Design a binder for this molecule. Structure first.
Ligand code: CDL
Ligand code: CDL
Ligand code: U10
Ligand code: 3PE
Lengths: 171, 96, 318, 347, 46, 115, 98, 99, 175, 83
């Protein structure tokens, strides 16, 4: 009952960021604060449009901004970061609780070499606002025309004509 | 002692979850590309696999709606390898 | 590298029960001023092997009134259930990291009683049916307290995952916060495994048999090795749940050494009480649980639902 | 059974039925049936006679099977619709499974060989509670789902009930047995009009409730269970059996007694739906119901029967029990025809 | 087909108590070794 | 995979031990070695006739009580809610009726074992 | 509607058939009664898990709560019929034929 | 409901589980949340008689999403035709669907 | 071979279902139910229902234990029946095995079965859905909401079970 | 007092378990309302971010909603650190 407009494979050929889960888990808080703007815009497109096929470009901006975050970390604090994510990776559950000392090296490194401050607790969980210039999708669900309401019940009530009108019951 | 330690664990879990929220945009961003890539690969192969059929117009949306329906996992990995199927459907359940 | 792991569990387990029978008599004897086996090998270090080898070479025989099929499968049920139950135990890192490990052990441990009466019913003996009917209501009534005690303690866990007990009692032993529940937990473990304040399942004084009524060399060995394995675990489960230990993520050997020591100490206590108390009569052991354990069981449950809320100490779900 | 437990046991039955008539979720409706069954089985075997045990037993297997089939038919409806609300069933197999699932609770078609002897074995008190209260819940479900009902199946359910109920009653002496078949006869009458106008079966339910109530607590006062035992009541209580005539005539639908109001009003509604052959049929086969009513009427006080000399001191003593609404129930069960248009209150 | 009972109670059927009976020896270790102790029990109460 | 391999290995290990149990020790048996054991003297004929025990009432309440523990099992994940007041009231409510059922079962003979 | 749905639906049919063919045992009859409960519980679990009807995951639990409740009722009824009539074959309770 | 006490008494007893798009715990949406959301918003107050004829495609999309009856049928035809074509030897799967 | 254990597990579920539905001796019926019950727990586990799978495992095992605990109590036959024993149970048994084995043959050889409903054989792995679950299992949070979203269900279930203990004593008391 | 004290002492002698269980059962209900940390337990559970804090479109006139996670405006849970 129609077609499916799958995007061009070329559109799905953006740079694919390559870091292991522990590397991302180590960056976490610092990544969230210094890369929120493209992140929030992309997901707002995801929630509003409800269609990734309409939000690839916003996904691309996330990858580019993710690269710049990781490009800066190698240029300045490659060693302490390499020490940190290795310490996270050893744990089977990847807990920050066991690598406080390596974290202490990492955050002070980016603080005095890249001007980054670790967000406080719950700060990364706040609800943010963005100024995306795309229009709000009028019909995100592509809803069909809503049915017309049934004839409204109104008018005044008067005594039933000739009573019950059932057999020999005059009234 | 249990009261204090449990509160500390709650604070740790908040930090754990906040860490998770940070990288959700990337995982969502990449996964949609992978899903669209998998569907696109399926569509091209479906066109090649059926060209002499009576009428199998490529990629007809069964649902009447024009909005995107979250795809079946079957239609994603359907023609892929056997190992891909098992690691996808019974991957998390079987990982003990 | 998984078959090696499994066979690195099955062989040590069967060898643990193997020499538990030696540390039984050699402990039982010393507590009754005897000396225990010290003839077969030095200090009796070869007696169970002599016992085991005999119990796989002396004539086995199915009873003339037996039910062959159910008679044979019951030892299969007992042994496989005992071995499969050690699987999610979180010795540093558990062999199988079940998300609901606690519920798993409850379910299968509730299954290890189908062996005892399938053996009893198929044996077609008057002492067999008596012992079978004694045991079933014994275990299930003791199972109601088993389920609630586990739940009340695990309310501070936040989940049923066995690995999280390591994290939960990281600074403080769990028994210091749930010692009233610890006492009934130990008693129930004494009751599910049928040790001897409530060994009425065997009932040797009044029922001569009942663990293994006409069961012979092979099947008797199973029904023994299937309950002595439960002895070691039900104290390993008690050790992991109540008496935690320090676990360095880099050197798990320290935790395994500590974990083994707690199981060894607990197992000795199982042997220790076994030779210090008389036998509970059937109505008494049922009265003790339905009329004294359960009222305290529910009351301490309600305490442990409310306790995290009043103290704002709800544990993390993850 | 201690009095306090009996009350709470009854309240659970009324709550179970009430849960059925107020819930909008299919699981809760099933729960209301389950609570109704659970609280009723002890009520049947209140006196612990040998008969009551299997009487209560035959209740249990029949209704548990009905409850399980009802649960299954709910599940398929969820599978094909994803809905729990009581609106309609979107799988024809799901509906065609519930009709019998509810029928055995009602006891209409050959899913009825439980009704006679379950009434027989149990006491007269629970017999009244069985044949009147236990039918509001299954009928309430049918009224709500009345839209998506296969008319061919539902009509055949009722037609079979009228025929068997009338035919079976002709060969019964135990008063409880004749009441069960008579109740089965009224089962078809209420359910026949179900697809067309749900207001009508509510009216027939209300009239049938008064008929069965007034008839039963007259039997309680007479303290009789067989036709012969009832016969002697003319010697002791003449007014009770004389009143029993009018209720028996009303129960047979002989107008202008109130029992005609369902049979009359129902026939008018279905002829509006071009159903003519079938309405003529139950008009015909309601007569066999009338037969064993008149035979009961003949045997009670229309012809005074041989008495027993042990009745002298029986006349010396009056009933201490205090049936209430019995003077009221007879009035609604006999003369409400002039107030027939009141069915619109239900509508 | 016989008439139903007048009090709606049938006469009690044949007695169905078997009262399992065993010999508690002489092999039994706690039966002093020489007792052929036979007991009648009401199922479990002797 | 991992769970079923462990389940398989246990039953093969148990079954192999049975196989060497009934085959390695050879048999010299007769009809008197297969006779049921009754502490010596001949059995009177039993072990399958109705052996009516007394704890049937409390045996079946265990089934009822085992359903209570099923209902209150999800408590560890129930505490992770935003409306603990309702959760606490309902959680104690199930415990109260569980206690109430036991108490009423207690008072009317109940746990007492029939003679 | 894959084949697992066929297996448990066809299973429930044999539970229905098994119940409706009482041969010689009330206890075996009650077995088929609780048998029905498996397929209903299992099918219900498959439905609300496949559809991610998370709030409806309680429905299989509430089925089980009212499941054993009937099971207790059946055996309790089976207690007296076997107690006062000796056995549990469903043929000796025909005194209510008249 | 036969006697709608929930509407009159103004409280909720089971109007929280009867549909898949209600307030699920922690806002966990169901599979066919959007499909049923359109269907309910389609036929709201229109009556069952009008709903079964007007809001028909919305129900069909929703019922299909529930079971994937046609979509799985489409996949079944793809695999069967691919199987015979591969078995005969006309064409072989491309290297992306091998590893 | 590990293609999809759903059918294999459900098949043993049916064969075990066939068993006790053929009316064996009640004790052997418990075994026939238990294998179906155990493998049924396996089916739900494979579908993601980890808690519910072990849930039916624990409750039923206790449920059926008191079932055949009762059969040997007062429902035992002085000469118990078996899977072979009487030709009726033999006939009822073998009928079930040949029946189910016919449907699966009818199932796996065209994949377009149309008995009652529609049943097409394509693999139960297909109906699975792509998507994460965050840091919580969906099933566990669903049954956890019983104390927050299902306060009405708790009341009716709790009251019914409390009444369940009242009826059980009242029925079994007698005299 | 005399009636109650005699009853409690007598029950404390014959059935220590029941009077015990009724105690903790009694306390398990009435303190949770009295204790002031119950609101903290609600706040801790509410503050836990299982789902994403989905951004809301900024059309202006939303002073309280922050534009960056490090912004001062918004729900701050420094009390958890102190607690
Ligand atoms: C469910 C499937 C049930 C299949 C079945 O018929 O089971 C009968 C089986 C045997 O019944 P029995 O009362 O022991 O009687 C066996 C002889 O008839 C009576 O004893 P016997 O001494 O005659 O036993 C030897 C006999 C029977 O064979 C055996 O005893 C071997 C083991 C059982 C095979 C079946 O051997 C043969 O008949 C010849 C075999 C070639 O009963 C069961 O309960 C077994 C069910 C096993 C299900 C799978 C478990 C995993
Ligand atoms: C139409 C709408 C209006 C319906 C009107 C219903 C009229 C009922 C007339 C009863 C008149 C009294 C008489 O001679 O009674 C016989 C008879 C009792 O026979 P009995 O031999 O006098 O009883 C001696 C006691 O058991 C001796 O006591 P016990 O030591 O055996 O302890 C048990 C006793 C305890 O009683 C109390 O505690 C009070 O139980 C009763 O008295 C039964 C009633 C219990 C309270 C029910 C409260 C309901 C609200 O009454 C019943 O069996 C009543 C059944 C339950 C109520 C009626 C259910 C049927 C109506 C359903 C449809 C409703 C409309 C739907 C549209
Ligand atoms: C009342 O109270 C009572 C008690 O208490 C409450 C009691 O206690 C007791 C008990 C009484 C006493 C303690 C008194 C004294 C009595 C005794 C000590 C009795 C002693 C009894 C024994 C049984 C002796 C136990 C001693 C020993 C030493 C046991 C030693 C064990 C062994 C020899 C075996 C160990 C295990 C082995 C070798 C396993 C080997 C496994 C393998 C090689 C691998 C197997 C698996 C595979 C290959 C997997 C791969 C295969 C595949 C996949 C096959 C696939 C096939 C296909 C077809 C597909 C009583 C009576 C009692 O009245
Ligand atoms: C039409 C209604 C009557 C249908 C026929 C009834 C049977 C024939 C009449 C005789 C019945 C036998 C009999 O004994 O009748 C008299 C009886 C009361 O007898 P007794 O107690 O002597 O009266 C004292 C009055 N102070 O009193 C009665 O029988 C009264 C009969 C009342 C019938 C119901 C009336 C309902 C309202 C109209």
């Amino acid at each position: 009952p129609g077609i499916v407009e799958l995007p061009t494979l070329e559109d799905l050929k953006v740079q694919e960021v390559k870091v292991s889960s522990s590397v991302l888990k180590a960056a976490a808080h610092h990544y969230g604060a210094q890369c929120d703007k493209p992140n929030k815009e992309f997901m707002l497109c995801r929630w509003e449009e409800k269609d990734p096929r309409r939000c690839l470009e916003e996904g691309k901006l996330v990858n580019q901004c993710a690269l710049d975050f990781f490009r800066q970390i190698k240029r300045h604090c490659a060693e302490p970061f390499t020490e940190y994510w290795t310490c996270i990776d050893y744990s089977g559950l990847q807990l920050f609780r066991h690598c406080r000392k390596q974290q202490a090296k990492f955050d002070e490194c980016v603080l005095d070499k890249l001007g980054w401050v670790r967000p406080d607790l719950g700060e990364l969980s706040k609800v943010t606002k963005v100024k995306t210039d795309r229009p709000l999708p009028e019909n995100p669900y592509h809803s069909r025309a809503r049915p017309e309401p049934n004839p409204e019940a109104e008018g005044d009530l008067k005594p039933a004509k000739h009573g019950s009108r059932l057999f020999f019951w005059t009234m | 002692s249990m009261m204090k330690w449990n509160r500390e664990r709650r604070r740790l879990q908040i930090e754990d979850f906040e860490a998770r929220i940070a990288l959700m945009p990337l995982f969502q961003a990449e996964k949609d590309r992978r899903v669209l890539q998998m569907l696109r690969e399926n569509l091209e192969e479906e066109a090649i696999i059926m060209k002499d059929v009576p009428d199998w117009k490529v990629g007809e949306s069964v649902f009447h709606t024009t909005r995107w329906v979250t795809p079946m996992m079957g239609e994603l990995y359907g023609l892929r390898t056997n190992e891909e199927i098992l690691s996808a459907t019974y991957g998390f359940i079987w990982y003990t | 590298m998984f078959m090696i792991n499994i066979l690195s569990l099955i062989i040590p387990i069967l060898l643990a029960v193997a020499f538990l029978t030696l540390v039984e008599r050699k402990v039982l004897g010393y507590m009754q001023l005897r000396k225990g086996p010290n003839v077969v090998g030095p200090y009796g270090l070869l007696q169970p092997i002599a016992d085991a080898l005999k119990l796989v070479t002396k004539e086995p025989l199915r009873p003339g009134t037996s039910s062959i099929s159910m008679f044979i499968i019951a030892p299969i049920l007992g042994l496989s259930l005992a071995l499969t139950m050690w699987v999610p135990l979180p010795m540093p890192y558990p062999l199988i990291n079940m998300n609901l490990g606690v519920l798993f052990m409850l379910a299968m441990s509730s299954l290890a009683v189908y062996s005892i009466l399938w053996s009893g019913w198929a044996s077609n003996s008057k002492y067999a049916l008596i012992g079978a009917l004694r045991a079933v209501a014994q275990t299930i009534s003791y199972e109601v307290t088993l389920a609630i005690i586990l739940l009340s303690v695990l309310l501070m866990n936040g989940s049923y995952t066995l690995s999280t007990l390591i994290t939960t009692q990281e600074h403080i032993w769990m028994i210091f916060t749930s010692w009233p529940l610890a006492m009934m937990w130990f008693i129930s473990t004494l009751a599910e495994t049928n040790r001897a304040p409530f060994d009425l399942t065997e009932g040797e004084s009044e029922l001569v048999s009942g663990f293994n009524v006409e069961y012979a060399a092979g099947p008797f060995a199973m029904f023994f090795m299937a309950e002595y394995a439960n002895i070691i675990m039900m104290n390993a489960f008690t050790a992991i749940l109540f008496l935690g230990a320090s676990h360095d993520p880099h050197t798990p050997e320290l935790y395994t050494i500590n974990f083994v020591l707690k199981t060894l100490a607990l197992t000795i206590t199982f042997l220790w009480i076994r030779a210090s108390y008389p036998r509970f009569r059937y109505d008494q052991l049922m009265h003790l649980l339905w009329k004294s354990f359960l009222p305290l069981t529910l009351a301490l449950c309600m305490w442990h639902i409310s306790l995290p809320i009043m103290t704002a100490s709800i544990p993390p779900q993850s | 059974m201690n009095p306090i437990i009996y009350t709470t046991l009854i309240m659970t039955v009324m709550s179970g039925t009430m849960l059925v008539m107020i819930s909008s979720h299919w699981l809760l409706i099933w729960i209301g049936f389950e609570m109704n069954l659970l609280a009723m089985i002890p009520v049947l075997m209140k006196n612990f006679n040998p008969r009551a045990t299997e009487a209560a037993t035959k209740y249990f297997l029949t209704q548990a099977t009905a409850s399980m089939m009802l649960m299954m038919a709910i599940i398929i409806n969820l599978l094909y619709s994803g809905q729990w609300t009581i609106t309609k069933m979107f799988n024809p197999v799901a509906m065609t499974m519930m009709t019998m699932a509810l029928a055995m609770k009602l006891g209409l078609s050959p899913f009825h060989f439980w009704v006679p002897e379950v009434t027989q074995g149990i006491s007269l008190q629970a017999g009244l509670l069985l044949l009147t209260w236990q039918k509001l819940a299954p009928l309430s479900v049918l009224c709500q789902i009345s839209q998506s009902i296969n008319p061919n199946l539902m009509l055949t359910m009722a037609m079979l009930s009228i025929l068997i109920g009338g035919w079976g009653g002709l060969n019964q002496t135990q008063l409880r047995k004749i009441m069960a078949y008579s109740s089965i006869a009224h089962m078809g009458w209420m359910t026949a009009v179900l697809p067309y106008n749900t207001t009508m079966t509510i009216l027939n339910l209300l009239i049938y409730i008064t008929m069965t109530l007034a008839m039963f607590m007259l039997l309680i006062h007479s303290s009789a269970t067989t036709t012969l035992s009832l016969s002697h009541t003319w010697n002791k209580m003449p007014v009770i059996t004389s009143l029993m005539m009018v209720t028996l005539l009303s129960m047979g639908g002989l107008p202008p007694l109130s029992g005609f109001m369902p049979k009359w009003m129902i026939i008018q509604e279905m002829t509006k739906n071009e159903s003519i052959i079938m309405p003529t049929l139950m008009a015909m086969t309601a007569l066999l119901n009338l037969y064993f009513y008149m035979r009961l009427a003949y045997s009670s006080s229309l012809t005074m029967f041989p008495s027993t000399n042990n009745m002298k001191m029986k006349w010396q003593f009056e009933h201490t029990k205090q049936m209430k609404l019995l003077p009221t129930m007879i009035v609604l069960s006999t003369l409400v025809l002039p107030m027939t248009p009141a069915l619109s209150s239900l509508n | 087909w016989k008439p139903p009972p007048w009090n709606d109670v049938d006469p009690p059927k044949d007695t169905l108590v078997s009262n399992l009976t065993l010999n508690f020896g002489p092999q039994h270790p706690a039966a002093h070794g020489v007792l052929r102790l036979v007991m009648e029990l009401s199922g479990e109460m002797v | 995979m991992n769970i079923m391999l462990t389940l398989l290995t246990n039953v093969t290990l148990a079954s192999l031990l049975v196989l060497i149990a009934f085959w390695l020790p050879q048999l010299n048996a007769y009809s008197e070695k297969t006779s049921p054991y009754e502490c010596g003297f001949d059995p009177m004929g039993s072990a399958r006739l109705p052996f009516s025990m007394k704890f049937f009432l409390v045996a079946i309440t265990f089934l009822l009580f085992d359903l209570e523990i099923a209902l209150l099992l999800p408590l560890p994940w129930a505490s992770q809610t935003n409306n603990l007041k309702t959760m606490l009231t309902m959680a104690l409510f199930l415990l109260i009726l569980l206690a109430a059922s036991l108490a009423y079962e207690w008072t009317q003979k109940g746990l007492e074992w029939a003679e | 509607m894959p084949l697992v749905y066929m297996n448990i639906i066809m299973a429930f049919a044999i539970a229905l058939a098994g119940l409706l063919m009482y041969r010689s045992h009330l206890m075996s009859s009650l077995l088929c009664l609780e048998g029905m409960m498996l397929s209903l519980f299992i099918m219900s679990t498959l439905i609300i898990l496949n559809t991610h009807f998370t709030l409806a995951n309680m429905m299989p639990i509430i089925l089980l709560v009212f499941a054993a409740c009937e099971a207790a009722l059946g055996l309790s009824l089976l207690v007296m019929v076997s107690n006062t009539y000796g056995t549990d074959y469903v043929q000796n309770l025909n005194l209510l034929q008249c | 409901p036969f006697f709608d006490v929930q509407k009159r008494l103004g409280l909720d007893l089971d109007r929280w589980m009867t549909i898949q798009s209600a307030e699920q715990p922690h806002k966990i949406p169901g599979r066919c949340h959007a499909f049923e959301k359109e269907w309910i918003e389609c036929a709201h107050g229109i009556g069952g008689i009008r709903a079964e004829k007007e809001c028909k495609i919305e129900f069909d999309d929703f019922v299909e999403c529930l079971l994937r009856q046609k979509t799985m049928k489409r996949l079944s035809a793809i695999k069967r035709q691919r199987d015979k074509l591969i078995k005969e030897g006309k064409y072989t799967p491309p290297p992306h669907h091998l590893g | 071979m590990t293609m999809y254990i759903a059918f294999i597990l459900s098949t043993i579920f049916v064969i075990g279902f066939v068993g006790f539905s053929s009316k064996p001796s009640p004790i052997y019926g418990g075994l026939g139910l238990i294998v179906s019950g155990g493998v049924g727990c396996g089916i739900v586990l494979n579908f993601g229902g980890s808690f519910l799978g072990l849930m039916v495992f624990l409750i039923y095992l206790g449920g059926m234990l008191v079932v055949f605990g009762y059969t040997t109590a007062m429902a035992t036959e002085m000469y118990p029946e078996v899977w072979v024993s009487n030709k009726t149970v033999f006939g009822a048994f073998v009928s079930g095995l040949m029946m189910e084995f016919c449907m699966v043959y009818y199932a796996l050889k065209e994949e377009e079965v149309e008995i009652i409903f529609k049943f097409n054989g394509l693999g139960d792995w297909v109906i699975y859905d792509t998507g994460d679950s965050g840091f919580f299992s969906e099933e566990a949070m669903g049954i956890a909401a019983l104390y927050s979203y299902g306060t009405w269900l708790v009341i009716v279930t709790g009251w019914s079970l409390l009444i369940g203990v009242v009826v059980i004593m009242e029925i079994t008391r007698g005299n | 007092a005399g009636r109650i004290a005699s009853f409690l002492k007598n029950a404390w002698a014959k059935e220590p378990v029941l009077v015990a269980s009724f105690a903790i059962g009694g306390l398990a209900i009435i303190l949770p309302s009295l204790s002031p940390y119950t609101n903290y337990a609600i706040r801790i559970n509410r503050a836990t971010p299982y789902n994403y804090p989905v951004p809301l479109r900024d059309d202006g006139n939303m002073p309280d909603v922050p534009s960056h996670p490090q912004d001062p405006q918004g729900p701050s849970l420094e009390w958890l650190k102190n607690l």
